[PDB]
């Protein structure tokens with residue numbers, strides 16, 4: 135990550151862009167596994183092996199409350215969604231596949247956001 139991602143405080147204008155990025159991911163066809171916290175009745179061992187769970191509804195709550203102070207912190211929570219999924223599930227599972235697709239989409243949208251901050 136470059137300097138302004140790490141170092142620049144998020145302004146109110148930045149927050150309007152973060153809301154747009156988040157809603158784009160929530161609307162993606164492959165986002166279904168990640169919209170809400172993992173249901174323990176689906177996977178009784180999940181919360182014993184994943185130390186720091188994350189999901190898009192938790193990120194929405196955090197955006198609304200202005201939890202994030204730097205872009206790096208927002209990127210770190212999003213990356214945790216995908217890394218948790220690739221650690222828990224095998225590489226041939228549809229869950230793992232969805233993480234691959236949605237992370238690529240996030241990177242496209244994140245590049246767009248970064249370009250819009252400065253010029």
Ligand SMILES: COC(=O)C1CCN(C(=O)NC(C)(C)C)CC1
Pocket residue numbers: 167168172173176177218219222223229
């Ligand atoms: C992002 O979601 C996940 O990583 C969980 C979601 C719940 N899940 C399953 O329903 N898989 C079983 C039934 C085969 C255990 C495990 C993976």
